[PDB]
Design an enzyme around this catalytic site. Sequence first.
Site, PDB file in Angstrom:
ATOM      1  N   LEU A  36       0.820  -1.207   0.000  1.00  0.00           N
ATOM      2  CA  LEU A  36       0.000   0.000   0.000  1.00  0.00           C
ATOM      3  C   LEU A  36       0.858   1.263   0.000  1.00  0.00           C
ATOM      4  O   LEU A  36       0.561   2.218  -0.727  1.00  0.00           O
ATOM      5  CB  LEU A  36      -0.943  -0.011   1.204  1.00  0.00           C
ATOM      6  CG  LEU A  36      -1.813   1.233   1.408  1.00  0.00           C
ATOM      7  CD1 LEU A  36      -2.685   1.473   0.190  1.00  0.00           C
ATOM      8  CD2 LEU A  36      -2.661   1.105   2.667  1.00  0.00           C
TER       9      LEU A  36
ATOM     10  N   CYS B 199      -8.331  -9.053   7.416  1.00  0.00           N
ATOM     11  CA  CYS B 199      -9.486  -9.405   6.602  1.00  0.00           C
ATOM     12  C   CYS B 199     -10.131 -10.717   7.012  1.00  0.00           C
ATOM     13  O   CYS B 199     -11.248 -11.004   6.565  1.00  0.00           O
ATOM     14  CB  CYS B 199      -9.068  -9.494   5.134  1.00  0.00           C
ATOM     15  SG  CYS B 199      -7.489 -10.347   4.935  1.00  0.00           S
TER      16      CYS B 199
HETATM   17  N1  LIG Z   1      -2.874  -5.794  16.378  1.00  0.00           N
HETATM   18  C1  LIG Z   1      -2.091  -5.569  15.327  1.00  0.00           C
HETATM   19  N2  LIG Z   1      -1.245  -4.480  15.315  1.00  0.00           N
HETATM   20  C2  LIG Z   1      -0.433  -4.248  14.223  1.00  0.00           C
HETATM   21  N3  LIG Z   1      -0.468  -5.105  13.142  1.00  0.00           N
HETATM   22  C3  LIG Z   1      -1.297  -6.178  13.150  1.00  0.00           C
HETATM   23  C4  LIG Z   1      -2.122  -6.429  14.236  1.00  0.00           C
HETATM   24  N4  LIG Z   1      -2.830  -7.549  13.969  1.00  0.00           N
HETATM   25  C5  LIG Z   1      -2.478  -8.008  12.745  1.00  0.00           C
HETATM   26  N5  LIG Z   1      -1.529  -7.164  12.229  1.00  0.00           N
HETATM   27  C6  LIG Z   1      -0.851  -7.271  10.927  1.00  0.00           C
HETATM   28  O1  LIG Z   1      -1.403  -6.370   9.989  1.00  0.00           O
HETATM   29  C7  LIG Z   1      -1.139  -6.877   8.699  1.00  0.00           C
HETATM   30  C8  LIG Z   1      -2.182  -6.442   7.685  1.00  0.00           C
HETATM   31  S1  LIG Z   1      -1.656  -7.042   6.065  1.00  0.00           S
HETATM   32  C9  LIG Z   1      -1.999  -5.446   5.280  1.00  0.00           C
HETATM   33  C10 LIG Z   1      -0.748  -4.815   4.683  1.00  0.00           C
HETATM   34  C11 LIG Z   1      -1.005  -3.725   3.655  1.00  0.00           C
HETATM   35  N6  LIG Z   1      -2.434  -3.608   3.403  1.00  0.00           N
HETATM   36  C12 LIG Z   1      -0.215  -4.013   2.381  1.00  0.00           C
HETATM   37  O2  LIG Z   1      -0.624  -3.658   1.277  1.00  0.00           O
HETATM   38  O3  LIG Z   1       0.849  -4.636   2.419  1.00  0.00           O
HETATM   39  C13 LIG Z   1      -1.104  -8.392   8.828  1.00  0.00           C
HETATM   40  O4  LIG Z   1       0.032  -8.904   8.173  1.00  0.00           O
HETATM   41  C14 LIG Z   1      -1.018  -8.655  10.318  1.00  0.00           C
HETATM   42  O5  LIG Z   1       0.092  -9.470  10.608  1.00  0.00           O
END
Ligand SMILES: Nc1ncnc2c1ncn2[C@@H]1O[C@H](CSCC[C@H](N)C(=O)O)[C@@H](O)[C@H]1O
Lengths: 828, 826
Positions: free
Chosen positions: A386, A461
Amino acid sequence: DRISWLGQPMKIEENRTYYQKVSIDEEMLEVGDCVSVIPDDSSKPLYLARVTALWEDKNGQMMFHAHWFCAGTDTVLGATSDPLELFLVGECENMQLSYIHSKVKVIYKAPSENWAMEGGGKTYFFQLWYNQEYARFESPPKTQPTEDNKHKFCLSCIRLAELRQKEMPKVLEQIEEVDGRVYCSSITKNGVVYRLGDSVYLPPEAFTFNIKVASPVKRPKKDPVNETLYPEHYRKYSDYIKGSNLDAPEPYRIGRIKEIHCGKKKGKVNEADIKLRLYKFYRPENTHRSYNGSYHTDINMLYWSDEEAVVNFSDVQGRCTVEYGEDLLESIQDYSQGGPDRFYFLEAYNSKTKNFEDPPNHARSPGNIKLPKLRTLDVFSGCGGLSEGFHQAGISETLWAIEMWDPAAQAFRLNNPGTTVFTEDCNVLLKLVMAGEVTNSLGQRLPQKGDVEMLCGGPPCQGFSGMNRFYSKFKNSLVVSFLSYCDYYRPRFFLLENVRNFVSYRRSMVLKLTLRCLVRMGYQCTFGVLQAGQYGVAQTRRRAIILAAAPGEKLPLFPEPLHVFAPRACQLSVVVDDKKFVSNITRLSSGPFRTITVRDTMSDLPEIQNGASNSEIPYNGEPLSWFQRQLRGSHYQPILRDHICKDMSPLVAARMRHIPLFPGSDWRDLPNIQVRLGDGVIAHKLQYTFHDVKNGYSSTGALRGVCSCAEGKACDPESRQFSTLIPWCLPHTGNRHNHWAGLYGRLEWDGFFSTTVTNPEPMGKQGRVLHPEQHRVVSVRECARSQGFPDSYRFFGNILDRHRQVGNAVPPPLAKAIGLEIKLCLLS
Amino acid sequence: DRISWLGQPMKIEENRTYYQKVSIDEEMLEVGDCVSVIPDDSSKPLYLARVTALWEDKNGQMMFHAHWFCAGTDTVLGATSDPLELFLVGECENMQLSYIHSKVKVIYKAPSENWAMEGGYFFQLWYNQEYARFESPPKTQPTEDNKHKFCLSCIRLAELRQKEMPKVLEQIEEVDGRVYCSSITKNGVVYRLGDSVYLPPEAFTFNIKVASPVKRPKKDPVNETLYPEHYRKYSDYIKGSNLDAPEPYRIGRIKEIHCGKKKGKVNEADIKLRLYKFYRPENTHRSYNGSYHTDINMLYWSDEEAVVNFSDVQGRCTVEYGEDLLESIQDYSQGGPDRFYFLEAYNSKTKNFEDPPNHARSPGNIKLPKLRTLDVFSGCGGLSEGFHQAGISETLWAIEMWDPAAQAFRLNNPGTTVFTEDCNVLLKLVMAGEVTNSLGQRLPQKGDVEMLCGGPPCQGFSGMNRFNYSKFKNSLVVSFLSYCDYYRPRFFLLENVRNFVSYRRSMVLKLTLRCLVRMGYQCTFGVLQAGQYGVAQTRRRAIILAAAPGEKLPLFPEPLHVFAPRACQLSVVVDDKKFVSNITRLSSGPFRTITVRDTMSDLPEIQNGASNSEIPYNGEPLSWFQRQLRGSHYQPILRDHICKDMSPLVAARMRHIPLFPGSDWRDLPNIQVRLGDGVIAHKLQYTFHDVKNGYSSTGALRGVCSCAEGKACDPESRQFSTLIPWCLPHTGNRHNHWAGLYGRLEWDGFFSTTVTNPEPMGKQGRVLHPEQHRVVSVRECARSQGFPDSYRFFGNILDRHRQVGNAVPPPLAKAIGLEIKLCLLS
DNA sequence: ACTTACGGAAGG
DNA sequence: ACTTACGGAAGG
DNA sequence: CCTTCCGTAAGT
DNA sequence: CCTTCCGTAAGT
Ligand SMILES: Nc1ncnc2c1ncn2[C@@H]1O[C@H](CSCC[C@H](N)C(=O)O)[C@@H](O)[C@H]1O
Ligand SMILES: Nc1ncnc2c1ncn2[C@@H]1O[C@H](CSCC[C@H](N)C(=O)O)[C@@H](O)[C@H]1O
Ligand SMILES: [Zn+2]
Ligand SMILES: [Zn+2]
Ligand SMILES: [Zn+2]
Ligand SMILES: [Zn+2]
């Protein structure tokens, strides 16, 4: 009852008598105030409008114009709205004063001058303008009445007049009138100015080419499939091929405006029916080469023609820039990347000669500010798909990132050397800043109010993913955690991404309150579903996008599609409470560019066997498509990275060898054979010892059930079969899972990926992950190819870790597409 | 911010300091005013309440009691509600004065003294979230003691839970930890020794142990060439079947009542009851076979004993010895509810019937004015016939645009002014001051109408028709509401089909209810199953009740007969808020289910195409159900026992339908039949693959058109005059294999929804006799509707069939009418 | 551990 | 006339 | 009726 | 996925 006028009438016209004040049933009414009225036609119990004008017609009636409001229930908010809150809309009526219930009181709640530093009977109020078509909460316009306007001032009438005059076609300068037909120089519609020598987009049905289409060949059924060698082929009466562009529309037609003529209507020029005759432009896939020569060419290269065609000005979607090769002061790579809708041509195409020329001289054209990147905080950064796309738009330097998963934060640091990446829990970290602390335990500086200018993120998601079987839950959720970051920091721009089912989850409630909170913050906001495949990748990936802009800024619009795509996957509408909402996108028909396919995605990668572990192997060749040239750059780089396969079991491996190569193949084509594997392991045949009440008997009289539930009974354990080549569980529950279509399925070269996952398994719910020809699972690089990642982008960890990094990621093309729309609002 | 008391404090409790007034942040608050507070745990964005008390706790803080209001969106009304309208709820809680956001002013809008002659923030009604009942606010008022903490929500809560809780009244002797009692009560019902009580069927056993041997299953293999459509019956479901029907309530005679003790006093929470098991005739060795002709309220005394919990008690019933009665047993059983009787006694070891002992014997061992009722959409009059069976209304006016229904209405109602005009036209003449119509019939005007009832057309909302706000403004459902708006009756009933409250996502319902709230009417709604009130037909109908402010809103009738649970799902959901009727009987009920045998076992054998309108009975009534509709008076002539003259091809189909339960078209053989003259019924040819149903056991195909292979439907493939109807396997797979078509009812079963035209190839086409090769007769459809055999119809056979189809069963109308009766008293 | 094994509902 | 011919969604 | 698709828990 | 059910319009 009886209603008398107050004072001398103001700004009366020769045929209409505006006043200043009136009295209803001994009340007081004046311009500024607002009035209630009971409906005749709607489900609503009452309407609320604003006064405007004060005129008594010469017919004897007394009427007044009314700028209607919008109850929060009338909006996308619904029952979760503020019952004291109203919104401005583009509905307006002229109405007799006898329908006035009586006077209301609505106050304008303007955002504070200290708005960016906050966040730590019945009287209505409004703050933002609502547009019910695309569901957009915008800050109200700031235009004022003057002497001409004070008696007629209706913002809804002005927005209607400005929009309709914008939408109307109009002739600007006209050349000469000849025998009833007047020829033109320059016309315009929808704010676009068209002149002679400009190119223009037209739908595919506008005109044909003189090269005759080749459509006589028809493919009959190859043979009757054996139903004991292939006892599961009968489940393919679907006639549906997953991820195939056979129904994909053809892109925009492009023509060079030779001339403009029209007609006359009542002495004046009939601007409503303008005609355009053009020179047809030839996409390389429209020549005799057609699609099979269409693989290496750029997506914006055309071929000049001298063929002609007359089309209506009504079918013009937009204007594009097409120039000849040798006339450009810069390269073709720097010219194509300098703006949208930019095409080029080096040769010309004769329909009869079937050869390529130097184009004639009449096709040749005349001669024949530092953008501040925005400090961005990327919560749930993942690998950074992103934030990478936002950088490709050149509008943001992501200074901070929060990613609790360690391999994702490391991969983020690998690609963003100037980002302070926190592996904390997002709510643990926010509480740290609320306590006034400067750094965490490791010494990383915490962002404060005023530092972040844009907030973006893609929360998990798995809760709304439409794949997995199993109020304060929302208040403790992670999406509300991401909302208090926007509540605390008050950034200028806000973007939230999630799967398309984010806006249908829990009867659409989660989004109803997601925008419910942004509007209480005074934020402009909007939502919509976008197909990533419409922006440059060969993957259907519908994701819900929630945009928001500070009151001082301008709310961005959604990016309009660049590539055509299969129509069954671009269904971007969203239904909430029987009101259908669309995005501001206007391109449904087709788009400027051809669809991106799997061959443009992976045709350059070298052949690897299942279970590849060599993390750095050389390219044995150069880029084979425009899409690969975009991700590999033009600089010399011989090392291909992350082109590694999962090491599958000898049983799964044997299954994939027996998946046919032809498009649409999957497990239902597996033979019921015995194959012996590594060492002395043997893969057994599948025994059909049960009736299938729904599926009946076979062509050979054999049965089609493998368990007692196929007879309507309770499933009996020990009837389960193991080490079978035709997996036992798929015919077991196939009837109520659409026969598990796609599992052990192959992508086709002329097609595209499904939604690329975090773990590619051929017997998972999305199991179309076999290579089009190779007997192996898709590799890590092939997934980020389908995710639009450059070959320069790097990941971290083991094979599964870097797979999930690609799957969880926002496609940079989709983020770049959105990012460009945010830049347009940075200007002015 | 800072909160200070003002005035002298009111009566102060040990730990609570009541006050009358108080000032928080420049405002002054008095008890009775209303306040706004912001929520934190509800999706609703604001709450509003009226302050009832103003105490300060002993811990230091200052608190107040808040009787919450109900936003119109909180209700069943939702978004259509008047946005400044709120309703009273039984919700209340004590809170800090720190949460007070604003001071709102809400005023009571009472109905005028000239309210019935009208029709040409605020609050007015009380809302019950569980039953969706808008009722008039209670007339309870404060006196000096209660005035400081007067909360109507709390006294309705206190009286509710104290009526609900069990309580010992009269105690007897206390013996070694167990105290025996002679009187206990719960739910407002007092129980005494010698009384009989209802209990679930899971309460106790019988010493006659029931025989349930696994009779012969999986009998034979069916030839898929002779019966090539039998494979479509893999569902193992037979519709109209009472095999999953529960057993009625268990009845026992309380002989002793004992319980325990907790902390020195009686443990009223755990009261035990010892009873004498009562034997229903179907519980004896005769079982169902012997209990065909017996009454539904006759029991058999037994000296068998069993001890059950008082928490399991469902209700009290009255059981009398037969010879101890001062009246007949018909005058006794027809004189009240829950009334049973017994004349003999049953011994389980001896397995025949004695005369009961002396200890089973009993001790000794106001004219109501009917309502002037107008019945719009009267049909033949099944609705007002039920009201007259309850004796609560003489229906003086009626509107019915269809002639055979208006004629059949007069034939049964001799003192009713039946207008056959259009309903919209007739009221328009009342609006213009017209006394009579074109014919000289006097028009009803305000004051004459005391009750308005009607069943508007179902054809728009019915769930079988395919071609389904302005349309609401035009429709007859609002036409029927303007009559309610002009005459302003004391009571209002609207009947329609179940999915009336699911049509257009429950918007017709929310607008039908909203108008009655705007006219000041109390109102509620619910779904009722007619089979739960004495008929052998599953007929779910949505009922809308309403009452004038001065009257008391009636409640829905509680089921009298157990029924198939699959067809008694009475709950409805609008905007994901599940609403239910006030009905409390769910698992079981007092009386067994009315079955097909109880409905047509007495009617003579007739061939297909009967036109004999007046034939004699082939004997006497053969059940309790028939004895109710045939009366005690000698009547030898049976009316309207005629069936439709079917085509010779259809005639051949019915004869080839097996008589065993659950049979329908899927059991027809694929052969040729010789018909009248030289007419031949041709075989059905299977010349297409069915890609979803596969091949047969014989290797034959299971498709009759190109669509079965996924192609476009090919014309010229249609087969005519074939015994197995060509259209049934053609579109079967996407139509549940057309279950029920050419189907037979079961003697032990019940009817489907009897419609207006019984044709076996319709959507509901199980209209074949359980034994005879014919469609059900007009009388048999009237029997399934609960009509007396005394009831007259008019027209041809089709016009008669429609009259019984669109009628609402008099049993269900009688059930509702009796509930309206209980409001006219007290 | 890794391979198998599999609700829905929502739109269409 | 009347005999055949068949879309749903909404609930469970 | 069929197609969508940043899956997890039960099995061993 | 499986049952509900005061049907109507196309066709003879
Ligand atoms: N409580 C939390 N605090 C911070 N990150 C978290 C979380 N719970 C899950 N995540 C992480 O948030 C990530 C969202 S993946 C989304 C990444 C982004 N949309 C892109 O394009 O790359 C997941 O990999 C997960 O490991
Ligand atoms: N516009 C109208 N005015 C008066 N009656 C009408 C009408 N439109 C239809 N009807 C009649 O209303 C009747 C409803 S049948 C319901 C009758 C009643 N519930 C009973 O138990 O008998 C239909 O038979 C139909 O003929
Ligand atoms: Zn206007
Ligand atoms: Zn099974
Ligand atoms: Zn209370
Ligand atoms: Zn067909």
